[PDB]
Design an enzyme around this catalytic site. Sequence first.
Site, short mmCIF file in Angstrom:
data_model
loop_
_atom_site.label_atom_id
_atom_site.label_comp_id
_atom_site.label_asym_id
_atom_site.label_seq_id
_atom_site.Cartn_x
_atom_site.Cartn_y
_atom_site.Cartn_z
CE1 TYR A 60 -3.85 2.06 0.48
CE2 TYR A 60 -2.37 3.32 1.82
CZ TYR A 60 -3.66 3.46 1.05
OH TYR A 60 -4.52 4.16 1.13
CD1 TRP A 110 -1.56 7.68 -0.87
CD2 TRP A 110 -1.55 9.46 -1.97
NE1 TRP A 110 -2.88 8.25 -0.99
CE2 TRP A 110 -2.84 9.30 -1.66
CE3 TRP A 110 -1.07 10.51 -2.95
CZ2 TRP A 110 -3.85 10.09 -2.11
CZ3 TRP A 110 -2.28 11.26 -3.55
CH2 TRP A 110 -3.61 11.16 -3.22
N1 PGD Z 1 -3.23 7.89 12.32
C1 PGD Z 1 -3.43 8.03 11.07
N2 PGD Z 1 -4.36 8.96 10.53
C2 PGD Z 1 -4.74 9.20 9.25
O1 PGD Z 1 -5.68 10.08 9.08
C3 PGD Z 1 -4.09 8.34 8.21
N3 PGD Z 1 -4.03 8.51 6.93
C4 PGD Z 1 -4.11 7.14 6.37
C5 PGD Z 1 -4.19 7.53 4.64
S1 PGD Z 1 -5.64 7.97 3.86
C6 PGD Z 1 -3.58 6.77 3.72
S2 PGD Z 1 -3.50 7.14 2.04
C7 PGD Z 1 -1.95 6.39 4.46
C8 PGD Z 1 -0.75 7.02 3.19
O2 PGD Z 1 0.49 6.46 3.86
P1 PGD Z 1 1.40 6.24 2.62
O3 PGD Z 1 2.48 4.80 3.17
O4 PGD Z 1 0.79 5.90 0.93
O5 PGD Z 1 2.47 7.64 2.76
P2 PGD Z 1 3.48 8.33 2.07
O6 PGD Z 1 4.26 9.21 3.17
O7 PGD Z 1 2.84 9.12 0.63
O8 PGD Z 1 4.69 6.94 1.28
C9 PGD Z 1 4.76 6.85 0.06
C10 PGD Z 1 6.36 6.61 -0.34
O9 PGD Z 1 6.45 6.16 -1.56
C11 PGD Z 1 7.76 7.03 -1.79
N4 PGD Z 1 7.72 6.84 -3.34
C12 PGD Z 1 7.20 7.82 -3.92
N5 PGD Z 1 7.43 7.85 -5.23
C13 PGD Z 1 8.19 6.68 -5.42
C14 PGD Z 1 8.38 5.77 -6.44
O10 PGD Z 1 8.53 5.98 -7.62
N6 PGD Z 1 9.11 4.80 -6.36
C15 PGD Z 1 9.35 4.13 -4.89
N7 PGD Z 1 10.02 2.92 -5.04
N8 PGD Z 1 8.95 4.96 -3.98
C16 PGD Z 1 8.30 6.14 -4.13
C17 PGD Z 1 7.79 8.03 -1.07
O11 PGD Z 1 9.02 8.36 -0.83
C18 PGD Z 1 6.95 7.88 0.24
O12 PGD Z 1 8.27 7.26 1.38
O13 PGD Z 1 -1.63 6.92 5.70
C19 PGD Z 1 -2.69 6.50 6.60
N9 PGD Z 1 -2.32 6.60 7.82
C20 PGD Z 1 -3.00 7.39 8.67
N10 PGD Z 1 -2.61 7.12 10.13
N1 PGD Z 2 -1.93 18.71 2.41
C1 PGD Z 2 -2.41 17.25 2.47
N2 PGD Z 2 -1.63 16.36 2.95
C2 PGD Z 2 -1.99 15.10 3.19
O1 PGD Z 2 -1.66 14.38 3.67
C3 PGD Z 2 -3.38 14.79 2.58
N3 PGD Z 2 -3.76 13.56 2.25
C4 PGD Z 2 -4.73 13.25 1.23
C5 PGD Z 2 -5.50 11.86 1.66
S1 PGD Z 2 -4.82 10.39 1.04
C6 PGD Z 2 -6.77 11.85 1.95
S2 PGD Z 2 -7.54 10.31 1.98
C7 PGD Z 2 -7.54 13.11 2.33
C8 PGD Z 2 -7.91 12.83 3.86
O2 PGD Z 2 -9.07 13.66 3.77
P1 PGD Z 2 -9.67 13.90 5.28
O3 PGD Z 2 -11.17 14.43 5.31
O4 PGD Z 2 -9.82 11.91 5.99
O5 PGD Z 2 -8.67 14.44 6.16
P2 PGD Z 2 -8.17 14.84 7.83
O6 PGD Z 2 -6.92 15.97 7.69
O7 PGD Z 2 -7.85 13.35 8.24
O8 PGD Z 2 -9.72 15.42 8.76
C9 PGD Z 2 -10.28 16.58 8.04
C10 PGD Z 2 -10.82 17.19 9.32
O9 PGD Z 2 -11.33 16.44 10.26
C11 PGD Z 2 -11.34 16.95 11.60
N4 PGD Z 2 -11.95 15.86 12.41
C12 PGD Z 2 -11.24 14.97 12.87
N5 PGD Z 2 -11.89 14.20 13.66
C13 PGD Z 2 -13.13 14.67 13.79
C14 PGD Z 2 -14.52 14.32 14.40
O10 PGD Z 2 -14.57 13.22 14.97
N6 PGD Z 2 -15.40 14.88 14.01
C15 PGD Z 2 -15.29 16.09 12.99
N7 PGD Z 2 -16.54 16.81 12.89
N8 PGD Z 2 -14.24 16.27 12.53
C16 PGD Z 2 -13.08 15.72 12.88
C17 PGD Z 2 -9.98 17.17 11.45
O11 PGD Z 2 -9.74 18.17 12.61
C18 PGD Z 2 -9.77 17.83 10.00
O12 PGD Z 2 -9.62 19.22 10.02
O13 PGD Z 2 -6.64 14.18 2.06
C19 PGD Z 2 -5.89 14.17 1.13
N9 PGD Z 2 -5.16 15.68 1.09
C20 PGD Z 2 -4.03 15.74 1.92
N10 PGD Z 2 -3.54 17.18 1.87
#
Ligand code: PGD
Ligand code: PGD
Length: 766
Positions: free
Chosen positions: A112, A114
């Site tokens: 998994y 990004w």
């Molecule tokens: N506590 C908590 N709260 C959250 O809201 C939360 N959000 C979750 C979400 S929605 C997701 S999507 C995951 C994201 O977690 P995800 O593991 O997708 O995070 P990235 O930090 O984008 O890691 C992507 C890695 O790919 C490497 N990379 C980029 N391009 C390439 C490439 O071409 N080749 C290779 N080999 N590597 C590359 C980058 O350097 C980076 O280290 O975090 C999840 N984890 C979360 N935890």
């Molecule tokens: N700048 C940036 N960095 C990223 O890493 C990034 N990740 C991307 C990814 S893969 C995704 S999946 C999306 C995630 O999009 P997602 O909507 O899951 O994002 P969050 O930052 O986890 O939360 C959005 C808001 O929810 C609020 N919140 C938290 N808990 C609660 C709750 O219990 N109730 C309510 N009403 N609000 C709450 C938080 O304070 C935050 O402001 O963002 C995408 N966009 C992203 N932008």
Amino acid sequence: LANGTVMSGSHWGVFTATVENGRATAFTPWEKDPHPSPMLAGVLDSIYSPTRIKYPMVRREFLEKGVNADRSTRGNGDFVRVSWDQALDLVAAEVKRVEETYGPEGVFGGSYGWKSPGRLHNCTTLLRRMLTLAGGYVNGAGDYSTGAAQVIMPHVVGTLEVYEQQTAWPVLAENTEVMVFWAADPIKTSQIGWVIPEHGAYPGLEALKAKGTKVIVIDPVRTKTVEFFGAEHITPKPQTDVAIMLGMAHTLVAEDLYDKDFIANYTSGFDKFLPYLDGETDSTPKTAEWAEGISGVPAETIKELARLFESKRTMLAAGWSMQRMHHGEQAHWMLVTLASMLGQIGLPGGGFGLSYHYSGGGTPSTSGPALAGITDGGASVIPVARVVDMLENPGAEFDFNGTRSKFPDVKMAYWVGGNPFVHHQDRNRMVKAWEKLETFVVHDFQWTPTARHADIVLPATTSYERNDIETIGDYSNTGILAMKKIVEPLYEARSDYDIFAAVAERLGKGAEFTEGKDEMGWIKSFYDDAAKQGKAAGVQMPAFDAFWAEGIVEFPVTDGADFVRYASFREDPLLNPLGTPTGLIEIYSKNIEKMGYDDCPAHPTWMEPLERLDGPGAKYPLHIAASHPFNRLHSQLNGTVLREGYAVQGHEPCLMHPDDAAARGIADGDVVRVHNDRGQILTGVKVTDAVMKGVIQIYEGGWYDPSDVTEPGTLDKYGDVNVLSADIGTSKLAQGNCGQTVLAEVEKYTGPAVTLTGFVAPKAAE
Ligand SMILES: NC1=NC(=O)C2=N[C@H]3C(S)=C(S)[C@@H](COP(=O)(O)OP(=O)(O)OC[C@H]4O[C@@H](n5cnc6c(=O)[nH]c(N)nc65)[C@H](O)[C@@H]4O)O[C@H]3NC2=N1
Ligand SMILES: NC1=NC(=O)C2=N[C@H]3C(S)=C(S)[C@@H](COP(=O)(O)OP(=O)(O)OC[C@H]4O[C@@H](n5cnc6c(=O)[nH]c(N)nc65)[C@H](O)[C@@H]4O)O[C@H]3NC2=N1
């Protein structure tokens, strides 16, 4: 040595690079980008930062003893540099060994992550393409973003819903009177795209603001979205939104305000939900008063919000944080139920949308063709966040959406394009479970915590060291971009494609992996296919060299700007039914009923989560809002100059309310220890009233830096918030992650001085 300018793209947007003497010296936003991201300067820095991985490396213990290596020292940094031919030989032998000894069930290839955009340099698809030729692998299903909502929506509205186009932004500007952002911070999250972003939300937001539309934000933190609009800000205790919703619903029934005709003609099962709502089945009427007891939002505000939503053209735009939590399936199901009662589903500017905060959802789509890329050539499948449960319980059974399967017995994991040592929950449990793997192989270009924990580490290139092609606009389909090579590969890095081709060659499957094509050979066949499809549709496109020379092709918008979600369903439900068993919106689901899962009932229900702020018998006092970073894309760009703009004494920032800080003797800028029964981290505090009392904000994505990998429960010196989360399923229906269901205590750190080691390379890889 090259001098000039090149146009390329990324997850942060289209940009032009200035190249001086073979080195990239600036990244300038595309002139047509309506709102560039300030993170582009870290994107440039990540190519050269001190954590760039220079050479192939093999963990000394694995090199010496293979499968008998001491696996508890993974992550201590004791690597040995090797040549490419030695590491390619070792990766190839390991894949062969595991596939023959254990079968396809011994190789975890869900990997998994990004990664980076690009239709050819798709590292996770290439990994699966290689593994398919080696005999197979176990894959992952779902994602960490909408793990619960993507499973519940198909039972309720008949489609996935979370990643489908929304009612066009221009339609909202003309028609919406009240815009609600529920657990959504569009200003923060719309900076990035899965494919290249067009940043279409910004003009959409500007247009609402210019028109004087009333905007309400329901979020525990006063975000940039609240400030942009000067919005009415409602701040609930995290994890209590469903209670709020039920109290609104109750009020609409009690005061006889709801749309009975919509309920009668477009929904199924309301009559089974009403008893619950009124308290006949449990003696607990779900009134605004009741909801105030759980969420702390005043009863009168709950009824006032209800009455307003019912009398104005209202759009409910909801974020995904609230379903990234225990029982997370109830949040969006209750939201759709509430939207049903209001009865504005299918009208211009009304209803609900689940993607206005991500990747440009609502940006008018064009009529251009779809671009496609390399393919993978193709229990064998597990819900992605069950990876750790799988490693601990080989052969055990698990429930998932009405079925039962067994966990495969995995012995090897091969990860590219992701950071599980940052993204997965309950770091200490995970670090112990990883000892079950014989071999762990990783490719990355930055020394993240994941790379540091591998047996074998292979340096990959960034997208800036190669050529690719990609769409602009996950929803808009604004155009197709040529992602042109900016500088040459650095040190001994190689593209993921090159590494996988070489491994496949060593398994005797070279030709099948490459299809006899080189980099430009693959890219032109994806383009020609898109041009052929465009010609059929009447969209004219140049020939490939002409395209490549201009670098981009834009498409026209025909009727995309009039798109209204659910209009044809509202217009004639029998002629245009939903994909649900009844063809209607399912408030009560007979299908869910028959699964008989205690943690996912057949209608939206309030249930107590594992741990919640001020919940009865809660052990810890603060909710951690472990949400997405403003100035990182997850963990990406953590090892760059951007860190200096937010770090507090070198650690990940912790936002804390003045009163909570005062009660512990903490002052702005102090180093504090955040801990609960699962783990302990260090963070630097920023005292602010931007977070509601009882809540602290620690963004996900901090690079885990353990003081000692052989010490169980060792202190993380940087601030990886996933050291404190629990690793459990939302429920048996979806099995989503609960990354934001987290309580902890905070105290002023008074232990020994700490030296941060995650932002420099391991000594042997210098
Ligand atoms: N506590 C908590 N709260 C959250 O809201 C939360 N959000 C979750 C979400 S929605 C997701 S999507 C995951 C994201 O977690 P995800 O593991 O997708 O995070 P990235 O930090 O984008 O890691 C992507 C890695 O790919 C490497 N990379 C980029 N391009 C390439 C490439 O071409 N080749 C290779 N080999 N590597 C590359 C980058 O350097 C980076 O280290 O975090 C999840 N984890 C979360 N935890
Ligand atoms: N700048 C940036 N960095 C990223 O890493 C990034 N990740 C991307 C990814 S893969 C995704 S999946 C999306 C995630 O999009 P997602 O909507 O899951 O994002 P969050 O930052 O986890 O939360 C959005 C808001 O929810 C609020 N919140 C938290 N808990 C609660 C709750 O219990 N109730 C309510 N009403 N609000 C709450 C938080 O304070 C935050 O402001 O963002 C995408 N966009 C992203 N932008």
